[PDB]
Amino acid sequence: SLSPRVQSLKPSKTMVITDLAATLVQSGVPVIRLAAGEPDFDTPKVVAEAGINAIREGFTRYTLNAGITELREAICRKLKEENGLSYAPDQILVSNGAKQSLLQAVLAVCSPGDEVIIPAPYWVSYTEQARLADATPVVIPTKISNNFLLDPKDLESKLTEKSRLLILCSPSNPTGSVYPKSLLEEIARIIAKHPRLLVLSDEIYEHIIYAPATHTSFASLPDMYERTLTVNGFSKAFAMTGWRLGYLAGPKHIVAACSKLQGQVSSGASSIAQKAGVAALGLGKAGGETVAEMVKAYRERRDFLVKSLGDIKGVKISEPQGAFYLFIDFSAYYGSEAEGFGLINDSSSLALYFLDKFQVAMVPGDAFGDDSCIRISYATSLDVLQAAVEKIRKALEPL
Amino acid sequence: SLSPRVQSLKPSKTMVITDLAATLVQSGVPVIRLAAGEPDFDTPKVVAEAGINAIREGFTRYTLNAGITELREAICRKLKEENGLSYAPDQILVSNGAKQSLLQAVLAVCSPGDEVIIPAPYWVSYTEQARLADATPVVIPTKISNNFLLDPKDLESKLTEKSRLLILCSPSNPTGSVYPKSLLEEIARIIAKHPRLLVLSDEIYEHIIYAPATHTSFASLPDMYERTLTVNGFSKAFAMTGWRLGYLAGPKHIVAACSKLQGQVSSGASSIAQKAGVAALGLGKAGGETVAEMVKAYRERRDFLVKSLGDIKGVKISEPQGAFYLFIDFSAYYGSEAEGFGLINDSSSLALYFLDKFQVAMVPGDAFGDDSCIRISYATSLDVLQAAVEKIRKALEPL
Numbered sequence: 001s002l003s004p005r006v007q008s009l010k011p012s013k014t015m016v017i018t019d020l021a022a023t024l025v026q027s028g029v030p031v032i033r034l035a036a037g038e039p040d041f042d043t044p045k046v047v048a049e050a051g052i053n054a055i056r057e058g059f060t061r062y063t064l065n066a067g068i069t070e071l072r073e074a075i076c077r078k079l080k081e082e083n084g085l086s087y088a089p090d091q092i093l094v095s096n097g098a099k100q101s102l103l104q105a106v107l108a109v110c111s112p113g114d115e116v117i118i119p120a121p122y123w124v125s126y127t128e129q130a131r132l133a134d135a136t137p138v139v140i141p142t143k144i145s146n147n148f149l150l151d152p153k154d155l156e157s158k159l160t161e162k163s164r165l166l167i168l169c170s171p172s173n174p175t176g177s178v179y180p181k182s183l184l185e186e187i188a189r190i191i192a193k194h195p196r197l198l199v200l201s202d203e204i205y206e207h208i209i210y211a212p213a214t215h216t217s218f219a220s221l222p223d224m225y226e227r228t229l230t231v232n233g234f235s236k237a238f239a240m241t242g243w244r245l246g247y248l249a250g251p252k253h254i255v256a257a258c259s260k261l262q263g264q265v266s267s268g269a270s271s272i273a274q275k276a277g278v279a280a281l282g283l284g285k286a287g288g289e290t291v292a293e294m295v296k297a298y299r300e301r302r303d304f305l306v307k308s309l310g311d312i313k314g315v316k317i318s319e320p321q322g323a324f325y326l327f328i329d330f331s332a333y334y335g336s337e338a339e340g341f342g343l344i345n346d347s348s349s350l351a352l353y354f355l356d357k358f359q360v361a362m363v364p365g366d367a368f369g370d371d372s373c374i375r376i377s378y379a380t381s382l383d384v385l386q387a388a389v390e391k392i393r394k395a396l397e398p399l
Numbered sequence: 400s401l402s403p404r405v406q407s408l409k410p411s412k413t414m415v416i417t418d419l420a421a422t423l424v425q426s427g428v429p430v431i432r433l434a435a436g437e438p439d440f441d442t443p444k445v446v447a448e449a450g451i452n453a454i455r456e457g458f459t460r461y462t463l464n465a466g467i468t469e470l471r472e473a474i475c476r477k478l479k480e481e482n483g484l485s486y487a488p489d490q491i492l493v494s495n496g497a498k499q500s501l502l503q504a505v506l507a508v509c510s511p512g513d514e515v516i517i518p519a520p521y522w523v524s525y526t527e528q529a530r531l532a533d534a535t536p537v538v539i540p541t542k543i544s545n546n547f548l549l550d551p552k553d554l555e556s557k558l559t560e561k562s563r564l565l566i567l568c569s570p571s572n573p574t575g576s577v578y579p580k581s582l583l584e585e586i587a588r589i590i591a592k593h594p595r596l597l598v599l600s601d602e603i604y605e606h607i608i609y610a611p612a613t614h615t616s617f618a619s620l621p622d623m624y625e626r627t628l629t630v631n632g633f634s635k636a637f638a639m640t641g642w643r644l645g646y647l648a649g650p651k652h653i654v655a656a657c658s659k660l661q662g663q664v665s666s667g668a669s670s671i672a673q674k675a676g677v678a679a680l681g682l683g684k685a686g687g688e689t690v691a692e693m694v695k696a697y698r699e700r701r702d703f704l705v706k707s708l709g710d711i712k713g714v715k716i717s718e719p720q721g722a723f724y725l726f727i728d729f730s731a732y733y734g735s736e737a738e739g740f741g742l743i744n745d746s747s748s749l750a751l752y753f754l755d756k757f758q759v760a761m762v763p764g765d766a767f768g769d770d771s772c773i774r775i776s777y778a779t780s781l782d783v784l785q786a787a788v789e790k791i792r793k794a795l796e797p798l
Binding site: 002019042043055099103108110253261269 | 402403404406442458460461496509510532665668671
């Protein structure tokens with residue numbers, strides 16, 4: 001029975017709480033749902049109508065494996081105009097979500113035994129995708145005091161003959177932290193010394209930024225363009241998670257190998273979702289007021305939760321600059337008598353205590369490589385956040 | 400640069416001919432295009448409206464990774480009713496097309512060095528997926544006189560301690576054969592001796608079948624449920640190729656390992672596509688007059704091409720029982736020098752000869768592991784087939 005690749009990954013830390021509550025264990029109790037990784041917003045009607053018209057017009061046959069020319073051309077424009085990067089259409093690979101885009105990159109560029117350097121807190125799939133490539137993940141913890149930003153000295157110390165891929169997610173899930181250009185520059189100098197090291201830049205949350213923070217894409221840095229794989233998509237910016245559209249832009253030989261890989265995984269991505277993709281790219285640069293209108297809401301929501309929660313004692317909060325996550329340091333509360341949850345010294349037990357006792361579902365930082373925190377998503381109505389703040393405050397002072 | 404496994408694949412006979420005729424049409428000469436592996440029909444308006452309705456009703460968010468509970472239930476209904484198979488909802492996995500379903504099954508159950516037995520002629524992807532799992536494909540040639548059906552004695556000679564998976568595609572791509580129950584019963588008995596051997600049954604063409612022939616699910620056979628992975632989908636029957644919807648049914652521990660894999664490869668399948676899937680399943684058993692009318696068009700199309708080509712001398716045909724492919728044996732024309740243009744040695748040469756000199760695009764049998772033949776797709780209008788038969792006759796008389 002079953003192969004080692006599947007056996008080697010991985011219990012999962014989400015189901016015990018995140019979806020087990022969204023179950024008859026709700027009955028008859030209601031639950032807030034603060035653990036979803038998707039926008040509360042609908043798909044833009046212009047984007048949605050493009051999909052409806054693609055269905056009507058018969059754009060329902062197989063696509064080119066790499067993607068339709070209009071989308072790969074439109075993505076290239078987006079990359080020059082928004083990120084200041086130059087790519088041709090044969091350097092673009094469109095996949096059914098960015099998750100596939102990231103995985104195919106790892107399988108294309110990593111030989112067995114290669115080391116993939118992953119900063120923690122990390123998106124869950126980065127560790128598992130390296131293992132599916134038979135590569136060795138090397139995790140570098142970071143601290144909240146440094147805004148969960150990688151330290152360049154720590155990157156220097158973990159370099160090896162085997163270091164092949166560095167994964168940078170900015171703005172990042174879960175911490176919602178954003179890399180400054182100067183920090184990425186120190187990183188870049190280091191990488192240029194290493195002959196084999198490549199960088200996977202996860203820019204899926206790019207248009208969700210706030211305030212003085214700026215998204216500066218890695219390939220724009222001096223000498224990095226040839227070493228960088230750029231990954232972006234339509235799920236987070238345009239609230240298109242169900243459509244499954246993502247893309248990779250990078251060196252042509254790497255994209256060509258990723259494309260040959262895709263011809264065997266799933267073939268090309270949805271013909272319907274891709275036509276919606278051109279429409280989404282057609283909304284404009286921000287892309288337009290529609291995303292801007294959404295980013296104003298997240299900005300408002302972020303500020304309510306940073307204020308309320310950061311004033312409870314023993315709770316640490318770094319102001320996030322991007323995305324819609326808050327990685328909250330509920331540690332210090334680890335002793336806790338507390339109640340039915342015995343020890344309450346875990347991110348998982350604590351997250352269990354918020355649910356299954358206070359009806360607030362969150363994701364333990366356990367899921368992301370740092371047990372000091374719990375991830376709270378504020379991509380929900382402002383009315384539910386005040387109620388969630390209300391449940392957290394009653395949960396925590398009884399300790 | 401790139402890893403082995405990306406580099407292990409590097410073939411593709413298909414690339415220069417079928418993808419290039421699209422280039423030669425894209426300026427000047429028109430070409431028939433008989434290399435289609437997709438229905439010429441539109442998606443059923445009922446199915447199309449359900450997807451358009453799902454867009455309007457806002458079903459654009461992430462679905463559960465395994466699939467929406469409504470679709471997995473309708474699939475279980477379809478599998479018990481049409482194929483006589485009993486599955487629970489947690490034994491079904493929905494993916495972006497059957498291609499993904501097959502890859503995840505192969506990756507789930509094959510260890511390095513394991514042997515994947517593939518009867519030839521074969522769909523190209525079976526070989527590549529096995530190599531992506533570090534399995535060793537072992538090909539078993541079959542003969543046109545035996546309707547390209549696997550020979551059970553030939554199976555026993557190649558069975559080994561390392562045999563893990565046998566892949567059975569019925570109805571077949573490229574041959575268009577259907578295994579009879581009696582032959583499938585004989586195979587089953589053979590595998591029952593081997594403790595490790597599993598069956599991947601690719602049943603995607605189940606409803607494109609012609610009247611005296613019957614589709615028998617391998618998992619219906621006694622002692623086989625425990626070892627069969629059933630793969631089906633909506634792409635070929637309902638002309639849903641662009642939608643990307645497929646599924647796998649099997650033992651609980653296998654489907655769980657496939658699900659952990661899918662959680663790292665693509666996440667769930669499209670929310671819009673899934674809701675169209677329930678509409679397609681709701682269409683009935685065949686389903687209804689909707690599927691029967693396309694199979695009525697395919698059957699006439701086939702019979703026109705068996706008679707027209709079979710009357711050409713040096714052409715050998717097994718009448719297909721399913722799907723819309725014809726694997727035509729143009730050998731005997733090998734060993735002949737055309738002018739000037741040059742040598743017609745092989746299926747590659749012959750297929751190149753039909754196109755470019757007589758404007759007819761086909762897929763060489765080289766692409767499917769059988770060099771004897773050329774694959775003609777008849778999922779196109781009866782009018783184009785007549786102009787191709789003329790061209791085939793005009794190409795064939797000069798030798």
